[PDB]
Design a protein around this nucleic acid. Sequence first.
RNA 1: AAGUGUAGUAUCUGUUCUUUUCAGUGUAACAACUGAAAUGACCUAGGCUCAUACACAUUUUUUGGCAGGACGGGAAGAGGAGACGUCGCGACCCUCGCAGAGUCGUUCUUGACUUGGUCGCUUGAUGUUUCUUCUUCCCGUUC
Length: 196
Amino acid sequence: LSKGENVPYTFQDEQVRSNPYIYKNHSGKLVCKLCNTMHMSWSSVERHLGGKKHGLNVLRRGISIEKSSXXXXXXXXXXXXXXXXXXXXXXGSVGLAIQVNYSSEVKENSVDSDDKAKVPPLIRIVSGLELSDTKQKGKKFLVIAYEPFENIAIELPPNEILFSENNDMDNNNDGVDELNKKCTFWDAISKLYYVQ
RNA sequence: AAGUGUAGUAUCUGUUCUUUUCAGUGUAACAACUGAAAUGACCUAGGCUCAUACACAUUUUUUGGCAGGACGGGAAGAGGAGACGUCGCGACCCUCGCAGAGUCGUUCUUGACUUGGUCGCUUGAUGUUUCUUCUUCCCGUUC
Ligand SMILES: [Zn+2]
């Protein structure tokens, strides 16, 4: 569960840490220096991190820094769709555009009970800091998801591309987020999802 | 090759949380627990704040009460007018000035005590009360 990381003792006088918080004191137990909470096992440590308590102390420490100045029934065939990445350009910079194609009424003929069928594909930017394997990380992914088909990701080394500035005139139908409404199109008649 | 029970401890995480008071328990004080419930008005957190039988028998109300056409002025020409009062336009007149008025006790404002008139109208306005309209011109309303 430790994912092979080495947490140095508090007295070893600090290699960069994943979270520079959880330590081991003079004794063998694990502690959160901010929260000042002792934890028996790494599982308890992860409960602490996933707990609201630790988070509140993180926000308090950030304030100190500024001062110092449906999920169940989800069908899953895990089928990799076909993406068509292509370097785009407009004006005045460079942006990316993806063309994802979906089934041709091949298997979607057995499921038509208006169960989120009206819901279009959704995209989100995920940090690689969390993976099923947790080995390497440090870059973002433009994940795209649809109920039956399997998720898809696209690595984005560049810190920022096509991140525009008030493209439209501030109209508020949040849909899912500014990203989706701002720059996505869902040709539902042909089943083609464009993203740029 | 793996493995139990008695007592007890620590540590995560999840979850809970005030509408306001009052009084009691409780507490080192808290906390916590136990009971009830203000509603209304006003002023710039606050309040010696406030509130929850008869009216019919003499002075009055059950009683002496009842009986081009029309209009409206103003003027002229022909066949409304007397009293008796009561309030006004002018003036040759009268009259000539700051105070309901006049005095005092006590205090920066109150308590007591006493007591337009005249003439015209040169066609001013009005209620008793007796008697006996037409034509023309002008200015307003209506159709
Ligand atoms: Zn913590």
